Write a protein that binds this DNA or RNA. Structure first.
Ligand SMILES: [Mg+2]
Ligand SMILES: [Mg+2]
Ligand SMILES: [Mg+2]
Ligand SMILES: [Mg+2]
Ligand SMILES: [Mg+2]
Ligand SMILES: [Mg+2]
Ligand SMILES: [Mg+2]
Ligand SMILES: [Mg+2]
Ligand SMILES: [Mg+2]
Ligand SMILES: [Mg+2]
Ligand SMILES: [Mg+2]
Ligand SMILES: [Mg+2]
Ligand SMILES: [Mg+2]
Ligand SMILES: [Mg+2]
Ligand SMILES: [Zn+2]
Lengths: 283, 130, 143, 78, 132
RNA sequence: GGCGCUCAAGCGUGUUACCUAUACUCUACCGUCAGGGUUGAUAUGAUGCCCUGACGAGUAGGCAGGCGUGGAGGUCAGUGACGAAGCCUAGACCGUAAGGUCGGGUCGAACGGCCUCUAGUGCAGAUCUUGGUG
RNA sequence: CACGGACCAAGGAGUCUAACGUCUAUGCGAGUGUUUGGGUGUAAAACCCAUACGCGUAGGUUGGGGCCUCGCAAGAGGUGCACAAUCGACCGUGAGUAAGAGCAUAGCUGUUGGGAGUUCCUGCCGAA
């Protein structure tokens, strides 16, 4: 929930210019909807899916791209990056050579993820190996560009890296295997254009009759809400949290005098009086 | 967002998770103090966190705070525990002052075990030197 | 505190089991002849002197009569016969449990022999061993 | 005849007679996940590991002090 | 009926966790009632329109009460004048949200209502007509 | 039932004693169900941990959870001539079990674990037919 | 024990698809569905526009979960969701109105159908 992100130059030095976050990143992150839509769409390569649900899943994936913990969870080596969501200067769109783009990626700190994808290449295990699906390798960083100026050609050859236009983002590209939080690199122009493409609090989304989804729960963290300050005033005193065992074993009163007295105090006096063996008058 | 992150990591793919035969789960995360995937355990799940981890002969302490959740490159602050075991525990308690007991207890236990491992690998690799 | 506790130490719950002095069987009384069913002197008749705090009965042969010295014997491994001797002659205070961890036996034996002499044939009884002959059924046998 | 009543106690379930739950291990990194749980768990080297890797795993396991269920397997027979 | 929502929505589960904790730790039955409502299926969560909110507030003494709808609220163009209130509900249609904001009212999630009224003080629960 | 029995080891009629079951009682354990405790956070996934109780035959019918077999996406910077996959293994460990892991044998070049969606668990018997053998 | 037995190897008793409906989850919401076409496209895809039509819209009192006051509590009340009860008005004697919920997708699944033997292991609920 930062206000803004700092652009980073291709060489690596942090850029003074800063860009406010778009409203997409503050959107619901729903694994279930993304999973269902991902299954339905992956069956096609057919299942009909509601357009609004599809956009919802896309927004959820985009929001997941900012949560570095989820990106680590999927497997990307985002341990060493300047920050998240990772933004790079717009000049990136105008690179013409693969080697220059790779060097810029090394400066960006995505070297580890690319090395992982390179090492992960292995021969296809199944018989699909001879049905045009022979080599399998892990997924690399995604580079988003507002407009192509030759960056697309440079980064085509390098393994693991896929580029997508801002106006055309894909759930399959954003959330491989129905898993949220793919590592993404946004060009500076792309980061700005995301607002126009998806919309902000006071800006139309540019999609006809579309608004970003609302949150059922205003706060993600339930621990903050449950603790709060006023609830604990409203809450009754707590228990032990590990119940004390009462009556693990049954002690028969007839055989154990202590519990017999506990159940009945008058038994003590009656024992002394021996009323049970009392003598009725002979009369 | 820590609760959301944890719930996704729990009911979806925690890539570092390994499902043992018993059914207990182990996060492979090197920074993880307790190698068991739980609410308190995944460094991914929790913003506030700490660990003892060995680098070379040293047994460093790594700190994680929600403030540096962004910029993951500089997230983990590195602190040198003194070779004296008592001083090391004192430093751990000091740095983990006013810090939830789970991480503190686990951190102390991990430091003890790593110290023992360093001692015993010195044992296995005793050489004629000195 | 030189080692932090690896794993944890589960403290045992407090136990409400207080040891109390033993309640001996009714037959066992000081000055009661006994039959030992195990050990070095199994099947040998002995005299009973006193009950110790650690629940080990103290017995004398006498070593003069049958060669069995002063010794501790467990109560359950012993049969008690109905014949008695008066133990008042022998004082039997000094020797105790910790003492066990010749002259004393002589002092005890003189007093015990003094009472043994009165009853006929008792010395012969204590001298000889006991065993089960064929056709002997213990359950009818009055000891 | 098998049935649920034969089920073993939870506290004793999935326990070898040595008292250690068996955990599969492929490489050194997976071994290191069992660093402190030496009392609760014992490592078991996978069937597909090569002989060169098994000696390294055994050395690291000895250093960590983690019991290996199947040492001297493919380095000795039976 | 149910012991937990059949839905696999993360946020609904979070709200259910919060409200079951409050119901366990609060004497007020309001938390229990809303907890049981959260489990209900779509058919058992009929939409409560802004129209019904207007009627519920017209009842005497309920003008300043916080209306609660465990579910969704839908707009109703039939009305021109709508009073100001701080409705709380799971979801709000764009029309209903605009109507509430326009009339000086405001819409809150159920967690924000829990922070406001842990015991449900001055609350008014409403349920839509489940004719079919 | 068999061997055997005939003042019965054959009957009916009464008496006790004695043997013992998926029956009943108590305890421990395993499962299903129900009622609960537990966050200014738990010394382990609030789908966690813990407490308490009830039940476990069940025909007709119906529901759930696991094991195994392939397909695809993602993932383990997985595994591999210091021997991958496949098959066998009256060997060891685990699980109530379907089975799983390891060891060994065999094998001799690549394949497996894990999250998701998608296909998909072993036998019986008949008409006979064909080859081959009388 | 009572009842039957040439011999070895195999092979070994029919197919895709439709209509209506209950329940559950998700998206939107007096709306809802696009794809009937086009643009765009590291190119069946993915992203986006219209273009239409489909199915929707066009009060009295009592009880009442809940919330407010008083009360330590039982209660005293006050107020009243859904819905019911009867009491009626109006529209046109009910499906009534006097403050609507549906559409779409997916899962499971009942019935009708178009040619149209046993059943991996465990558990659960249970007529007659
Ligand atoms: Mg506690
Ligand atoms: Mg009990
Ligand atoms: Mg093998
Ligand atoms: Mg419907
Ligand atoms: Mg009124
Ligand atoms: Mg018995
Ligand atoms: Mg505990
Ligand atoms: Mg029952
Ligand atoms: Mg039953
Ligand atoms: Mg695969
Ligand atoms: Mg096998
Ligand atoms: Mg067994
Ligand atoms: Mg009314
Ligand atoms: Mg009324
Ligand atoms: Zn984890």
């Amino acid at each position: 929930s930062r206000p803004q992100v700092t652009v980073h130059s291709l060489t690596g030095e942090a850029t003074a210019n800063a860009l406010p976050l778009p409203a997409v990143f503050s959107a619901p992150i729903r694994p279930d909807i993304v999973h269902t839509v991902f299954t339905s769409v992956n069956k096609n390569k057919n299942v009909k899916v509601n357009h609004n649900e599809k956009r919802y899943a896309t927004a959820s994936a985009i929001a997941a791209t900012a949560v570095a913990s989820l990106v680590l969870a999927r497997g990307h080596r985002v341990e060493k990056i300047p920050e998240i969501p990772l933004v790079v200067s717009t000049d990136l769109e105008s690179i013409q050579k693969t080697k220059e783009a790779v060097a810029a990626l090394k400066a960006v700190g995505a070297h580890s993820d690319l090395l992982k994808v390179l090492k992960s290449k292995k021969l296809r295990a199944g018989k699909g190996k001879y049905r045009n699906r022979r080599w399998t390798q892990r997924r690399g960083p995604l580079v988003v560009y507002a407009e192509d100026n030759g960056i697309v050609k440079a980064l085509r050859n390098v393994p693991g890296v896929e580029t997508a236009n801002v106006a055309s983002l894909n759930l399959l590209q954003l959330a491989p295997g129905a898993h949220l939080g793919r590592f993404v690199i946004w060009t500076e122009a792309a980061f700005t254009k995301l607002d126009q493409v998806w919309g902000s609090e006071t800006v139309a989304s540019s999609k006809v009759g579309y608004t970003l989804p609302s949150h059922i729960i205003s706060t993600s963290d339930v621990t903050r809400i449950i603790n709060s300050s006023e609830i604990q005033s409203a809450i009754r005193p707590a228990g032990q949290a590990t119940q004390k065992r009462t009556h693990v074993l049954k002690k028969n009163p007839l055989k154990n005098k202590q519990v017999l007295l506990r159940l009945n105090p008058y038994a003590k006096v009656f024992a002394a009086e021996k009323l049970g063996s009392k003598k009725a008058e002979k009369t | 967002s820590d609760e959301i992150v944890w719930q996704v990591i729990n009911q979806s793919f925690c890539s570092h998770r390994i499902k043992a035969p018993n059914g207990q789960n182990f996060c492979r995360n090197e920074y993880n103090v307790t190698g068991l995937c739980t609410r308190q355990s995944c460094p991914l799940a929790n913003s506030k966190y700490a660990t003892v981890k060995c680098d070379n002969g040293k047994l460093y302490l790594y700190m994680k705070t929600p403030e540096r959740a962004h910029t993951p490159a500089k997230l983990w602050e590195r602190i040198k525990l003194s070779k004296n075991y008592t001083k090391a525990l004192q430093q751990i308690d000091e740095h983990l002052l006013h810090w939830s007991k789970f991480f503190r207890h686990k951190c102390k236990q991990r430091f003890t075990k790593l110290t023992q491992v360093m001692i015993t690998e010195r044992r296995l690799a005793l050489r004629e030197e000195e | 505190p030189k080692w932090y506790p690896s794993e944890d130490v589960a403290a045992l719950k407090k136990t409400r089991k207080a040891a109390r002095p033993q309640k001996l069987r009714a037959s066992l009384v000081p000055g009661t002849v006994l039959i030992l069913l195990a050990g070095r002197f199994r099947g040998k008749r002995v005299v009973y002197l006193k009950h110790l705090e650690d629940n080990t009965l103290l017995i004398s042969g006498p070593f003069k009569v049958n060669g069995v010295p002063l010794r501790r014997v467990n109560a359950r491994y012993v049969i008690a016969t109905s014949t008695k001797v008066s133990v008042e002659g022998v004082n039997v205070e000094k020797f105790n449990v910790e003492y066990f961890a010749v002259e004393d036996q002589k002092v005890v034996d003189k007093a015990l022999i003094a009472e043994i002499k009165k009853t006929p044939l008792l010395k012969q009884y204590l001298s000889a061993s006991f065993s089960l002959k064929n056709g002997d059924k213990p359950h009818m046998l009055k000891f | 005849q098998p049935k649920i009543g034969y089920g073993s106690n939870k506290k004793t379930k999935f326990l070898s007679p040595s008292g250690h739950k068996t955990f599969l291990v492929a490489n050194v990194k997976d071994l290191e996940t069992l660093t402190m749980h030496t009392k609760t768990y014992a490592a078991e080297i996978a069937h597909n590991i090569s002989a060169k890797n098994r000696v390294v795993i055994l050395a690291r396991a000895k250093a960590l002090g983690i019991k290996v269920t199947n040492p001297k397997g493919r380095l000795a027979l039976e | 009926h149910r012991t937990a929502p059949k839905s696999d929505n993360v946020y609904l589960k979070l709200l259910v966790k919060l409200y079951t904790f409050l119901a366990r730790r609060t004497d007020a039955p309001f938390n229990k009632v809303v907890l049981k409502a959260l489990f209900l299926s779509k058919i058992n969560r009929p939409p409560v329109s802004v129209s019904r909110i207007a009627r519920a507030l017209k009842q005497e003494g309920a003008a300043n009460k916080t209306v609660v709808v465990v579910g969704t609220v839908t707009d109703d163009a039939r009305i021109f004048e709508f009073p100001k209130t701080t409705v709380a509900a799971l979801r709000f249609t764009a029309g209903a949200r605009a109507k509430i904001v326009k009339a000086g009212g405001e819409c809150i999630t159920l967690d924000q209502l829990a922070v406001r009224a842990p015991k449900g003080q001055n609350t008014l629960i409403l349920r839509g007509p489940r004719n079919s």
